[PDB]
Amino acid sequence: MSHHWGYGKHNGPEHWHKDFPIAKGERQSPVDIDTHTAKYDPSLKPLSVSYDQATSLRILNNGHSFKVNFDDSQDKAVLKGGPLDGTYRLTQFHFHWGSLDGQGSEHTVDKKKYAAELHLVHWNTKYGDASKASQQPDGLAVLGIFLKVGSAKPGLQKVVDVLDSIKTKGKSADFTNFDPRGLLPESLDYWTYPGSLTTPPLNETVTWIVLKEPISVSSEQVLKFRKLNFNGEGEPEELMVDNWRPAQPLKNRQIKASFK
> CA–CA distance from 50 to each of 180, 188, 210 (Å)?
10, 12, 17
Separation between Cα atoms, residue 26 and residue 250, nearest integer Å: 8
Separation between Cα atoms, residue 55 and residue 33, nearest integer Å: 32
Quick one: 220 or 232, whose CB is closer to ligand WYZ? 232
Is 51 within 8 Å of 68 (Cβ atoms)?
no
Q: Where are the alpha helices (DSSP H) in 117-256?
A: 130-133, 157-162, 219-225
- Residue with smaller CB distance to ligand WYZ, 151 or 232: 232
Shortest reach from residue 50's CB to ligand WYZ, in Å:
18
The region of 19-27, 43-51, 117-125, 246-254 touching Zn ion under the rule CB under 5 A is 117-125
Binding site for ligand WYZ (CB under 6 A): 4-6, 8, 10-11, 15-16, 18-19, 91, 119, 121, 123, 130-131, 134, 140, 142, 197-199, 201
Distance from C-alpha of 222 to C-alpha of 209, rounded to nearest angstrom = 23
Decide if residue 119 touches Zn ion (CB under 5 A). Answer: yes
Q: Tell me, yes or no, if 64 is annotated catalytic.
A: yes
Please, what is the minimum distance in Å from the beta carbon of residue 220 to ligand WYZ?
Answer: 25
φ, ψ for residue 199, nearest 5 deg: -125, 155
CB 96 to Zn ion: min, Å? 6
Rule CB under 5 A: which residues touch Zn ion?
A: 119
Task: Tell me the catalytic residues.
Answer: 64
